[PDB]
Amino acid sequence: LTEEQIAEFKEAFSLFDKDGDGTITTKELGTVMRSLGQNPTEAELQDMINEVDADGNGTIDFPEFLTMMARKMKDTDSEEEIREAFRVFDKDGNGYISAAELRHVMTNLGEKLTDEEVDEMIREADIDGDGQVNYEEFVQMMT
């Protein structure tokens, strides 16, 4: 891994962490995934957190989250995880995440940020300079 790779993962830890206390439970998984329109089962929640649990205690701190992001589990009928995530952002499915829709996604995840910041983010991912973020640019900022 690298400085920047570890830097993305700190931020992905922070969004699940809800009540603070630097740990993630099966509850924070289930809750944040249901706000993104998913519906986990109690058995499959426990198939995720207790897999990377260690040290006992029942929660996941950042060392654990960090190991998970490298030594992950394998997949089943999955392949296009970038189109599935893109689909979650691009509310009206025209293929272009507007600055407006990015603000909608961040507030549902709990982030209260400046308009200057909302557009700063669009401008980081906007390869062609049209003012919005499309799919072929989303895939590339991932890859």
Partner: peptide
């Protein structure tokens, strides 16, 4: 605040939740 890492962090949390 860091714009490139706020967007990246939220994209990976969405991928993890999906």
């Amino acid at each position: 605040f860091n714009a490139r890492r706020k967007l990246k962090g939220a994209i990976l949390t969405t991928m993890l939740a999906t």
